[PDB]
Amino acid sequence: MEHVAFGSEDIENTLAKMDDGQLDGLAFGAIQLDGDGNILQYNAAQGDITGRDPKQVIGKNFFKDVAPCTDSPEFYGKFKEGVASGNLNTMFEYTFDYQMTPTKVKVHMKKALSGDSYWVFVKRV
Ligand SMILES: *C(=O)/C=C\c1ccc(O)cc1
């Protein structure tokens, strides 16, 4: 397993060295999006939670297609502001409930080290 704690201050630095293979070792969900909400990476842990297939969601809009239950001021609203500002680091509780059992999780959004990429870290609570 890759030893990285959810909410770690330097998490964007640590994860810059990973690949899809290495990301699959994390204890929590991790989604990498571009400036437009498109999925660039999708680890095995978020798949265990949402039931999605990582390899099948890659390339689709996170907010439009895959997870419309996030299209909201509380989530998407926060993402867009972050993207436009060029900085993003917020943590909140959300309920995943689209075509799945209503699941309470902890969501950590943070801008990555790379120019135009954003992290979505998730964990059951
Ligand atoms: C609501 O849709 C919230 C979360 C979520 C995340 C990923 C996937 O694939 C579905 C739903």
Swiss-Prot record:
Modified how: The 4-hydroxycinnamic acid (p-coumaric acid) chromophore is covalently bound via a thioester linkage.
Claim: Transport is one of the keywords in the record: no
One Pfam family recorded for the sequence: PAS
Summary of the function given for this chain in its UniProt record: Photoactive blue light protein. Probably functions as a photoreceptor for a negative phototaxis response.
Lineage: Bacteria, Pseudomonadati, Pseudomonadota, Gammaproteobacteria, Chromatiales
PAS domain ranges (all copies): 23-86
Gene: pyp
Family affiliation: Belongs to the photoactive yellow protein family.
Ion transport is among the record's keywords: no
Subunit record text: Monomer.
Modified residues (S-(4-hydroxycinnamyl)cysteine): 69
Coiled coil segments of this chain: none
An example Gene Ontology molecular-function term: identical protein binding
Protein name as annotated: Photoactive yellow protein
